[PDB]
Amino acid sequence: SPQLEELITKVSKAHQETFPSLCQLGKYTTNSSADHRVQLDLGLWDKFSELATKCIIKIVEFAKRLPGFTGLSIADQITLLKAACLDILMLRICTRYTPEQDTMTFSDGLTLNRTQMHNAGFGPLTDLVFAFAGQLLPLEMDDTETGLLSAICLICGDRMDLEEPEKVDKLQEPLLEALRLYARRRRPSQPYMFPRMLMKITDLRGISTKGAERAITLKMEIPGPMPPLIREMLE
Ligand SMILES: CCCCCCCCCCCCO[C@H]1O[C@H](CO)[C@@H](O[C@H]2O[C@H](CO)[C@@H](O)[C@H](O)[C@H]2O)[C@H](O)[C@H]1O
Ligand SMILES: CC1(C)CCC(C)(C)c2cc([C@@H](O)c3ccc4cc(C(=O)O)ccc4c3)ccc21
């Protein structure tokens, strides 16, 4: 129990230090392609993809702060990151949804409306991702819960090509314990919150599968290759 409390603190801090809260960011906007959907606005794609690269680096930094992660083989660290990074990216941007303005906010404060999210690359996946974001809201997750859920998504022993999947399973166990303890303590009158959170992982995987499908069509629409850390994620 003391060790589980320290794990909660450590994961919470790692998330906050690699992912600013919506409340913390100085929002700004752009007038690019703001009023009508187009196939792709290349200036918005260039900015979006740069922000995605930076957030991948942050997710790697977060991962290496999770207790035990750097005790895994470097190969298994890389396999886990490749398998989960798009899931965690999708979760992160959906936690930055402002329903009253129908916007999402990136880590530099860039705040895009739904049409701009579409035009920056989401394309035909846009409205389904905004609906996922919308349905995250009733859970009223806090940053500790988002951090723990992200860790659970990453540290999962079912990933293909792991060398030591039983070791990965054993690292996930206290994360699961920690999220249930935390979630029930915070909202004892809503005991379905922990299972609802875990079922969001399945939803995220479905959105990330659709995002990988979108990457294939977007590749045809952009003049050069995607950024190298994005290509790492997609392989
Ligand atoms: C998901 C697919 C990826 C598979 C795993 C491979 C990802 C490899 C990531 C290792 C990154 C090495 O990191 C090394 O260079 C980064 C980029 O100059 C630095 O990154 C640094 O600058 C960034 C600015 O973009 C900051 O946001 C980081 O917080 C900061 O630490 C690191 O501090 C340094 O340790
Ligand atoms: C694979 C690829 C390139 C193409 C296909 C689509 C458009 C589906 C896509 C969507 C994302 C998207 O989840 C995303 C992007 C930037 C993000 C930036 C931040 C941040 O600033 O803190 C946080 C979350 C983010 C989340 C990432 C890559 C991709």
Curated annotation (Swiss-Prot):
A Gene Ontology term for the protein's cellular component: nucleus
Biological process annotations from GO: anterior/posterior pattern specification; apoptotic process; canonical Wnt signaling pathway; cell differentiation; cellular response to leukemia inhibitory factor; cellular response to retinoic acid; embryonic camera-type eye development; embryonic eye morphogenesis
Known tissue expression: Expressed in aortic endothelial cells (at protein level).
Keywords assigned by UniProt, alphabetized: Cytoplasm, DNA-binding, Isopeptide bond, Metal-binding, Methylation, Nucleus, Receptor, Transcription, Transcription regulation, Ubl conjugation, Zinc, Zinc-finger
UniProt keyword S-adenosyl-L-methionine present: no
Protein location: Nucleus; Cytoplasm
GO molecular function terms listed in the Swiss-Prot or TrEMBL record: chromatin binding; DNA binding; DNA-binding transcription factor activity; DNA-binding transcription factor activity, RNA polymerase II-specific; nuclear receptor activity; nuclear retinoid X receptor binding; RNA polymerase II cis-regulatory region sequence-specific DNA binding; sequence-specific double-stranded DNA binding
Ranges for domain NR LBD: 3-235
Location in chain, cross-link Glycyl lysine isopeptide (Lys-Gly) (interchain with G-Cter in SUMO2): K219
Superkingdom of source: Eukaryota
Quaternary data: Homodimer. Heterodimer with a RXR molecule. Binds DNA preferentially as a RAR/RXR heterodimer. Forms a complex with PUS1 and the SRA1 RNA in the nucleus.
Family as reported in the entry's similarity comment: Belongs to the nuclear hormone receptor family. NR1 subfamily.
Job description of the protein: Receptor for retinoic acid. Retinoic acid receptors bind as heterodimers to their target response elements in response to their ligands, all-trans or 9-cis retinoic acid, and regulate gene expression in various biological processes. The RAR/RXR heterodimers bind to the retinoic acid response elements (RARE) composed of tandem 5'-AGGTCA-3' sites known as DR1-DR5. In the absence of ligand, acts mainly as an activator of gene expression due to weak binding to corepressors. Required for limb bud development.
Domain notes: Composed of three domains: a modulating N-terminal domain, a DNA-binding domain and a C-terminal ligand-binding domain.
Protein name: Retinoic acid receptor gamma
Interval of the full protein contained in this chain: 183 to 417 of 454
